């Protein structure tokens, strides 16, 4: 059994990225399905800044974490990520192997990098050579 709302919040302190800006690489729509998971919320609790709250549904996450609050909430995200506490979670969302590895290693830039490199929405689905004449004939055709 797990599901522990650990109320041990004595300090506060999100840990964002200085080189790779998390808010410009990760958008609310990507974070929403993740943060809507109460399990990740558990891991974000120790890093939850003062005044911030954890939205339950993706829609309200978008409403609350528009930009200022988003950078703060994403900062606690990367904070739990840096600790590796948020690592195993990434695989359960169907996230890139490189991203889940990064989340376990606690590398926030690698996560952000691998996210938009692998979850890159260009709909590349179906790489198979059962079509395309990449080797053609020369005579008449």
UniProtKB/Swiss-Prot annotation:
Record text on subunit structure and interactions: Component of the 19S proteasome regulatory particle complex. The 26S proteasome consists of a 20S core particle (CP) and two 19S regulatory subunits (RP). Interacts with the proteasomal scaffolding protein PSMD1. Interacts with deubiquitinase UCHL5; this interaction activates the auto-inhibited UCHL5 by deoligomerizing it. Interacts with UBQLN2 and ubiquitin.
Map out region (Interaction with UCHL5) in residue numbers: 4-141
The entry's function note states:
Component of the 26S proteasome, a multiprotein complex involved in the ATP-dependent degradation of ubiquitinated proteins. This complex plays a key role in the maintenance of protein homeostasis by removing misfolded or damaged proteins, which could impair cellular functions, and by removing proteins whose functions are no longer required. Therefore, the proteasome participates in numerous cellular processes, including cell cycle progression, apoptosis, or DNA damage repair. Within the complex, functions as a proteasomal ubiquitin receptor.
Q: Where in the cell is it found?
A: Cytoplasm; Nucleus
Q: What family does this belong to?
A: Belongs to the ADRM1 family.
Per the record, the domain of life is Eukaryota
Instruction: Relay the domain remarks.
Output: The Pru (pleckstrin-like receptor for ubiquitin) domain mediates interactions with PSMD1 and ubiquitin. Preferential binding to the proximal subunit of 'Lys-48'-linked diubiquitin allows UCHL5 access to the distal subunit.
List the residue ranges of the region (Disordered): 113-141
Which residue intervals are annotated with compositional bias (Basic and acidic residues) in the record? 121-132
Residues modified as Phosphoserine? 139
PTMs per UniProt: Ubiquitinated by UBE3C in response to proteotoxic stress.
Full-sequence range covered: 270 to 407 of 407
Organism this protein belongs to = Homo sapiens
Cite the DEUBAD domain residue spans from the record.
11-125
For this entry, the protein name equals: Proteasomal ubiquitin receptor ADRM1
């Amino acid at each position: 059994s797990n599901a522990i709302l650990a109320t041990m919040n004595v300090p506060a302190g999100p840990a964002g990225g200085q080189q790779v800006d998390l808010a410009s690489v990760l958008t609310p729509e990507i974070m929403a399905p993740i943060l809507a998971n109460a399990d990740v919320q558990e891991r974000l609790l120790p890093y939850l800044p003062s005044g911030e709250s954890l939205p339950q549904t993706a829609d309200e996450i978008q409403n609350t974490l528009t930009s200022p609050q988003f950078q703060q909430a994403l900062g606690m995200f990367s904070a739990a990520l840096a600790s590796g506490q948020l690592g195993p979670l990434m695989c359960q969302f169907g996230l890139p192997a490189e991203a889940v590895e990064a989340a376990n290693k606690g590398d926030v830039e690698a996560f952000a990098k691998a996210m938009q490199n692998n979850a890159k929405p260009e709909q590349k689905e179906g790489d198979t050579k059962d079509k395309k004449d990449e080797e053609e004939d020369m005579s008449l055709d």
